[PDB]
Design a binder for this molecule. Structure first.
Ligand SMILES: Nc1ccc2c(NC3CC3)nc(-c3ccccc3)nc2c1
Ligand SMILES: O=C(Nc1ccccc1)c1cccnc1
Length: 335
């Protein structure tokens, strides 16, 4: 039996949500999100209505992707799905997708864009990012877009990773347009984020992709022989070979007065060579997180089937696949 939907118009768009969700109140804008009271759980929630979810092949697949990813995430430091619904009674009329998650208090952009943080605070927030990242990465998922505005924190300092300049946090292999980057592109982002929390300033505020690399190389130094031998694009190789050789900065001179353990972790995160960059699992056991690290409570994820990413299908097939996933959704445990 379907719940009772009620209809209302919120600013620019119509919303049709079960009666269970009350006091919809826009929080901003892929789609738009409202804060709501959820009568069944007693919780404040975020309800996102996807805009034009099935309007092109790209939208339809993206819609499918978002639903698949959210349904999979079950970890304290990663956003999870409370609910997913459509007002449609059948596939034929299936046109709208709404997703429901915990309402989070603020993003990390806010916490930093107002005050500097304590070292104890950065410890706990970086710890939590790494713990969520271990989990995400263990599923062979790469976030790819980690930045302060994608990290939600509530008043208790509890942190969750979500997906809602990017270039400022982006690993240099991606800047250089490498096709074969790994999971540690996210570690690079975590490094830029941590640096920003410790100093109150964007570590690498590039105006564009070239400026961005210039700023990066200025701290980390131009690639040595060992890394240059791994660069398969000639114009890329010859770009970095054509710049003036920059030496590696000592990070203790750069992050002066910061906890030396934090400086050390940063040294291990902000490595040009992605093969030598610390992983999330490794970083968790770094001395800097001594007061939080518990090797028996840093879980990995169930295997995640992303074989769909390589499929080329019709809009109606992505739509049908999305509908299946709506239908089979099992709400998480209440306790
Ligand atoms: N094992 C690795 C480690 C780092 C790499 C990297 N990093 C860029 C210097 C920052 N870039 C590239 C690459 C190859 C072809 C075209 C564009 C980029 N490959 C890398 C392979
Ligand atoms: O974007 C948010 N939640 C959300 C994320 C993905 C799907 C549905 C909802 C959000 C917004 C503001 C506070 N907390 C979560």
């Amino acid at each position: 039996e379907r719940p009772t939907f009620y209809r209302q118009e919120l600013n620019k768009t119509i919303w049709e949500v079960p009666e269970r969700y009350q006091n919809l109140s826009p929080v901003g804008s892929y789609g738009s999100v409202c804060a709501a009271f959820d009568t069944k759980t007693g919780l404040r929630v975020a309800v996102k209505k996807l805009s034009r979810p099935f309007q092109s092949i790209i939208h339809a697949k993206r819609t499918y992707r978002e639903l698949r990813l959210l349904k999979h995430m079950k970890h304290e430091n990663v956003i999870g799905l409370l609910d997913v619904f459509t007002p449609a009674r059948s596939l034929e009329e299936f046109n709208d997708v709404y997703l429901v998650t915990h309402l989070m208090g603020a993003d990390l952009n806010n916490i930093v864009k107002c005050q500097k943080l304590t070292d104890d605070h950065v410890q706990f927030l970086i710890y939590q990012i790494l713990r969520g990242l271990k989990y995400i990465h263990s599923a062979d998922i790469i976030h790819r877009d980690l930045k302060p505005s994608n990290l939600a924190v509530n008043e208790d300092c509890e942190l969750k990773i979500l997906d809602f300049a990017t270039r400022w946090y982006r690993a240099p292999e991606i800047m250089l347009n490498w096709m074969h980057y790994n999971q540690t592109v996210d570690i690079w982002s975590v490094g830029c984020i941590m640096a920003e929390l410790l100093t109150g300033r964007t570590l690498f505020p590039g105006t564009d992709h070239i400026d961005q690399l210039k700023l990066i190389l200025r701290l980390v130094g131009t690639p040595g022989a060992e890394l240059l031998k791994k660069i398969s694009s000639e114009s890329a190789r010859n770009y970095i070979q054509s710049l003036t050789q920059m030496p590696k900065m000592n990070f203790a001179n750069v992050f002066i007065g910061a906890n030396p353990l934090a400086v050390d972790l940063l040294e291990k995160m902000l490595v040009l060579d992605s093969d030598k960059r610390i992983t999330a699992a490794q970083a968790l056991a770094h001395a800097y997180f001594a007061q939080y690290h518990d090797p028996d409570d840093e879980p990995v994820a169930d295997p995640y089937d992303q074989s769909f990413e390589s499929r080329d299908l019709l809009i109606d097939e992505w739509k049908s696949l999305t509908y299946d996933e709506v239908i089979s959704f099992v709400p998480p445990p209440l306790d």
